[PDB]
Amino acid sequence: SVKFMDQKRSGEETVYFKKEDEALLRNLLANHPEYDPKYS
Amino acid sequence: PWTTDTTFDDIILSQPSKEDFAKFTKEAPLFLRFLKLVTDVEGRQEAFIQFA
Numbered sequence: 001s002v003k004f005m006d007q008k009r010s011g012e013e014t015v016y017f018k019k020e021d022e023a024l025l026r027n028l029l030a031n032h033p034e035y036d037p038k039y040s
Numbered sequence: 041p042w043t044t045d046t047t048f049d050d051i052i053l054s055q056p057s058k059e060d061f062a063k064f065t066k067e068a069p070l071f072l073r074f075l076k077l078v079t080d081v082e083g084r085q086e087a088f089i090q091f092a
Binding site: 040 | 069072085088092
């Protein structure tokens with residue numbers, strides 16, 4: 001029950017925030033081109 | 041060259057206006073690099089970000 005809950009929680013959070021990080025990596029360079037090395 | 045939407049004429053004979061002028065899309069990056077440099081020197085990055 002303990003390792004069960006912990007590992008389920010960790011996997012769910014990992015998947016969710018993996019998706020969110022993918023989306024943010026998609027939409028970063030547009031809204032923050034000052035970091036984009038394309039213009040440097 | 042043939043175009044289905046544009047026509048070539050003399051500027052003084054046409055007396056064209058801004059909307060009579062034809063529009064196209066130009067590639068930015070070569071200009072945007074130089075612009076980033078110039079704005080980093082001059083100290084106005086808001087303008088670079090807005091324009092980009």
